[PDB]
Specification:
The structure is cut from a larger assembly and holds chains A (206 residues), B (262 residues) and C (143 residues).
Chain A lengths: L40 E7 L3 E8 L2 E6 L4 E12 L5 H4 L8 E5 L1 H10 L17 H5 L4 H12 L5 H9 L1 E6 L10 E4 L3 H14 L1
Parallel strand pairs in A: 3-7
Antiparallel strand pairs in A: 1-2, 3-4, 4-5, 5-6, 6-7
Chain B lengths: L42 H8 L6 H8 L4 E3 L16 E4 L5 E6 L5 E6 L1 H4 L1 E11 L5 E5 L5 E2 L10 E5 L5 E5 L7 E3 L7 E9 L7 E6 L3 E5 L27 H15 L1
Antiparallel strand pairs in B: 1-2, 2-3, 3-4, 5-6, 5-8, 6-7, 8-9, 10-11, 11-12, 12-13
Chain C lengths: L37 H5 L19 E8 L5 E5 L2 E4 L6 E4 L2 E5 L12 E6 L9 E7 L7
Antiparallel strand pairs in C: 1-2, 1-6, 2-5, 3-4, 6-7
Classes of the chains: A alpha+beta (206), B alpha+beta (262), C mainly beta (143).
Chain A binds 3 RNA strands through strand 1, strand 2, strand 3, strand 4 and helix 1.
Chain lengths: 206, 262, 143
RNA sequence: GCAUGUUGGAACAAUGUAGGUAAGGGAAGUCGGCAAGCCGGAUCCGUAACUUCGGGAUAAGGAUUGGCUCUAAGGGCUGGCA
RNA sequence: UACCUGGUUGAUCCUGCCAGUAGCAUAUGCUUGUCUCAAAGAUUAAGCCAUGCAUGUCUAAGUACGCACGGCCGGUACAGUGAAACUGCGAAUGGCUCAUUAAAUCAGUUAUGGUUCCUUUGGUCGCUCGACUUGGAUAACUGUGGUAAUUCUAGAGCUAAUACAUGCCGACGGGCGCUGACCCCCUUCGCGGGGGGGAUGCGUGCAUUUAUCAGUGGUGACUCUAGAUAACCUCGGGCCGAUCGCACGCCCGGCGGCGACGACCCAUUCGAACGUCUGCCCUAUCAACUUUCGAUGGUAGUCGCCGUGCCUACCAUGGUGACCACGGGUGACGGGGAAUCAGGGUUCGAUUCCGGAGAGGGAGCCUGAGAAACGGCUACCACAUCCAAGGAAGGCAGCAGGCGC
RNA sequence: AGCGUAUAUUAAAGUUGCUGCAGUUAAAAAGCUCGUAGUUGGAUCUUGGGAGCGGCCGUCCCCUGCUCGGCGCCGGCCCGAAGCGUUUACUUUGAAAAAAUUAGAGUGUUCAAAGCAGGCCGCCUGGAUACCGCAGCUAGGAAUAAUGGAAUAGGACCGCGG
């Protein structure tokens, strides 16, 4: 196949690097993983040194860190948005490191509405019809209501994130390599990074 | 190479083993253990060549099955066990405890010690590794994992441990003017105090070790092993005492001993 | 006036999106008795191939040379000059071995013909294994 | 603009005139590859002998030739900028 | 040993070479009384091989109803030897030779802070808050057979594991933080404000990742380790002893020492790989060369156990060399060394002592920690073997020895 | 119990010449000058003084500083330790430089090629050195060849003020 070597090409001056030996087993290069989105299926590959490598094939979930409160949850991946260098990976939904994905807003919405006890998302016109969190919001004690108010005061979020929680599709990046370790970990884009990627999205669209 | 070595050549050997060329072609390969390859000396060679008890290799195998030789707090019956710097080889039947100390030349010196002296030995630590919950683990010169140490035990400070329990008794702090056995390179087996410390960033620091006979020599930081606090050794010393006298004086003392003997 | 590439360029240590209401610059020392210039602290440049504000280890051999080319970006080409004594004919011969050295963008006002200190590091590219430590000016040229 | 150019209908002999198709070999027939037949355009790589250095040269030679649906690059007007 | 003679002319001095002269390591020829040692398919033929061989191992401490044998008092299977096996390790070293091979290998020198690592040693083997031991396939054996024929084979009767999977008694009764009903205390007429005890539920050990805050020990140097918070624990799945053996004892059913093996994680030994400075044979009837099927750099991915256009999209048009880059040849593996030899120099080195290469020429591949292994696997070409003409198989530049030279 | 001969090669050579070649008449100055790389290059920057022991002559000590502390002593002096005080080549020293090999301490294999042995009526030793040019590092001095200061003055220093 193909391997990692320096002797196959020419020198810096221009000479020809002629070899002095045949093949080696450690000189070996495997093809890419090229994972997709779908049902859970991960292959394993035994590598040099008695170690294992988890190659992902299809994965529809992911763990993404929200950097302000530093708390991550398992979050469903629904769509691939944009890649920087290769624009063909925007069309062909192939996940590698440093790609933008749409993720669901419901686990972080449930965490916010359970801990902070404040309405997250909730476009004006549709009230809470099952009435599950409305009991947890009200019916509190007088001495703990001050602690709830102090937690309520330090809970300001920006409008650029508020619109994304309104639509229910957050943006996220890829930090861990899915081919090397197996886990597709990442983080949520915030602030100037989110403005930069949304400016690239707007420049691609119109 | 496709794999490790199984055999060992007699020519590929250091100078201090004193292995001659005529007797053998294939050298006894030492097994893997705490000490290095060239630093140690095998037990079968130490039995048949240096002390000269047995002659053939099968006799050492017949001896070691009856479990006579005890190595530094353990009855070890391995003929190719690496026995290196500051090891105590105890024999219960003959009652001759030996201590491995370098001579004033590059060779070792056979020295018999009391059982009270064989109860302890001197060792050196290398580093302090941080555990999974902030637990300091000592790294000795031949990998003795002992955790929860004393905070005064630094890198250059040496400790005095016990064989059967593996616990410290005393410690020699790395200070100026302490006796140091320089073990490495050309200046091998030297006794002298530290009269000057010179620092060097990047590389290791050079130390001007001075013997109290009008002799001084500079040696890098790797060949440092202090034994006592200034002028107080807690070990017994063999003949030679680390003088580093000249070859003309050695020839004169040899001629004087020859004229005294006859 | 940064990030002309397609991807987002940043330092992996700093964090700029915490709960607030100028970003502080992150740097580390190189050691071996050296200091840092004021422009490296005051600037806002980012480069991962930097000993101070980056991730590379300077160790091994420390050599010197002279700068002769500044055509390629983010790197310079140096040229060593030394002699050697031949035991057969008791005269000297000429030797030179040129090499490419990565150039940190903090060194702004650098001209050709100045003495440069190179330091061995990990191979970042095919024929570059050295970084720039300090640049000293030649004779004169106060302007 | 025209109603097949001094005529219409019928069957489909041989031999004529003009065309093509032809298993296999491929100028071995004949003064005579005569006639007849093959190659064919565009893009890309690439090119000898001799030379009045201009020609050779398209030398000799090779690979590609659809449908459907996308991505990237190159401009005017107004008030570093939209 | 820092050293000489003769020869051009009718005759004499210079230059010029020739004739010898003294060695080393190969063959040939004469002769070869003894003894200590003692080289010998390197030169052309890395071309092919008739013949025999070069890789096996049990202790009471893995599995033994082979009577193949054995103690008899057999009955609680079990004294022991024990063919043939399963299971675990090595088989990845050694030897041969210089074709290929001239910044390549190789010699002082060093760094992996940019990574792995069999075995041994030292730890680790009641940290988790949850069956007086559960399940079925099979090797060895017997028996029906085919095949010119292979160290080529199946259906049946069977049976075991330190082989394959699922998962318990105890430690274990209580702590750590998130959630918090509700009560109670101090001041105020009371709400408001402050401060302790606390019903119920959740997770709560190491291995792995993501990301924030803070900063015990050490380094010339941290984005090294560690502290806190929040989740991950991939079914192609990290650990959390459903193991074997010799003599043995004290208290109402329970209790305990001396062994072998394995395992989450770390140090160490043995190494391999990756590096940087310096050194090399000739030739200018070789002066320009290298490239968009990367030549010289960057951003972001892929890959590798790590650091690299190694491979990918887009930008810049660079880089080396007259101190000989590049190409061609070498009757060229490299170094330590050997010979003649004054001092200086010349030639050879394939060889034991060190490092790399490969098993007719290539191509690709499994297994295991370590192999592109070679007396490992498969395909093409050449050489080339048996045959019921249906088909099968091999690669001595190993030991002795042969063919051609 | 050793030689003649043949094939590769060394000294003889100052008949290849750094030690150590010639160029009128033997082969060897381009017909001739200019000319870029390369070689090499005028002079020139601290010139002896103080103390001791002998017979002006040989030896011996002196002619860059300030943060932390110990031979200490009475706000001060001495010295102990880190830091830094243009840069080379050469020279002095140290670190480091597998064995065998070359010279060889010891050395009755009866001598030698050897070898690292062995000898005293229970014991004692030796089993080293020279060699390892160049490459990298550490410690002295500044003769030799380069090397920089301030003259469109943004030259030092000492007291400053915002």
């Amino acid at each position: 196949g193909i391997s990692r070597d320096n002797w196959h090409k020419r020198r810096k001056t221009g000479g020809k690097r002629k070899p002095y030996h045949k093949k080696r087993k450690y000189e070996l290069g495997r093809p890419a993983a090229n994972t997709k989105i779908g049902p859970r299926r991960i292959h394993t590959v035994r590598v040099r040194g008695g170690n294992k490598k988890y190659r992902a094939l299809r994965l529809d979930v992911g763990n993404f860190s929200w950097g302000s409160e530093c708390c991550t949850r398992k979050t469903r991946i629904i769509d691939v948005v944009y890649n920087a260098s290769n624009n063909e990976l925007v069309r062909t939904k192939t996940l590698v490191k440093n790609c933008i994905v749409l993720i669901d807003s419901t686990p972080y919405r449930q965490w916010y509405e359970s801990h902070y006890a404040l309405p997250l998302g909730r476009k004006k016109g549709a009230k809470l019809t099952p009435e599950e969190e409305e009991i947890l919001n009200k019916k509190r004690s007088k001495k703990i209501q001050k602690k709830y108010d102090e937690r309520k005061k330090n809970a300001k979020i920006s409008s650029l994130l508020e619109e994304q929680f309104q639509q229910g599709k957050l943006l996220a990046c890829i930090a861990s390599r899915p081919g090397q370790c197996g886990r597709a970990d990442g983080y949520v884009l915030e602030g100037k990074e989110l403005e930069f990627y949304l400016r690239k999205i707007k420049a691609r669209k119109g | 190479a496709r794999g490790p070595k199984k055999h060992l050549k007699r020519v590929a050997a250091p100078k201090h083993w004193m292995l001659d060329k005529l007797t053998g072609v294939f050298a006894p390969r030492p097994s893997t253990g705490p000490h290095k390859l060239r630093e140690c000396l095998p037990l079968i060679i130490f039995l048949r060549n240096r002390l000269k008890y047995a002659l053939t290799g099968d006799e050492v195998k017949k001896i070691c099955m009856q479990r006579f030789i005890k190595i530094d707090g353990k009855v070890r019956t391995d003929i190719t066990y690496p026995a290196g710097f500051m090891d105590v080889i105890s024999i219960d039947k003959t009652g001759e405890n030996f201590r491995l100390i370098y001579d004033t030349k590059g060779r070792f010196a056979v020295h018999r010690i009391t059982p009270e002296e064989a109860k302890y030995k001197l060792c050196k630590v290398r580093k302090i590794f941080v555990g999974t919950k902030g637990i300091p683990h000592l790294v000795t010169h031949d990998a003795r994992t002992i955790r929860y140490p004393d905070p005064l035990i630094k890198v250059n400070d040496t400790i005095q441990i016990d064989l059967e329990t593996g616990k410290i008794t005393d410690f020699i702090k790395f200070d100026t003017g302490n006796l140091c056995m320089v073990t490495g390179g050309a200046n091998l087996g030297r006794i002298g105090v530290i009269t000057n410390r010179e620092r060097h960033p990047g590389s290791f620091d050079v130390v001007h070790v001075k013997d109290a006979n009008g002799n001084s020599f500079a040696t890098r930081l790797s060949n440092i092993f202090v034994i006592g606090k200034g002028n107080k050794p807690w070990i017994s010393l063999p003949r030679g005492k680390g003088i580093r006298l000249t070859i003309a004086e050695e020839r004169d003392k040899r001629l004087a001993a020859k004229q005294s003997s006859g | 006036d940064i990030q002309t590439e397609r991807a987002y360029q940043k330092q992996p240590t700093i964090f700029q999106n915490k709960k607030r209401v100028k970003l502080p610059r992150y740097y580390k020392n190189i050691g071996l008795g050296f200091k840092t210039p004021k422009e490296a602290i005051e600037g806002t440049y980012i480069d991962k191939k930097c000993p101070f504000t980056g991730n590379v280890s300077i160790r091994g051999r420390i050599l010197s040379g002279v700068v002769t080319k500044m055509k390629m970006q983010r790197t310079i080409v140096i040229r060593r000059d030394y002699l050697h004594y031949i035991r057969k004919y008791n005269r000297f011969e000429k030797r030179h071995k040129n090499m490419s050295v990565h150039l940190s963008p903090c060194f702004r006002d650098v001209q050709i013909g100045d003495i440069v200190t190179v330091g061995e590091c990990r191979p970042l590219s095919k024929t570059v294994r050295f970084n720039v430590l300090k640049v000293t000016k030649a004779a004169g040229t106060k302007k």
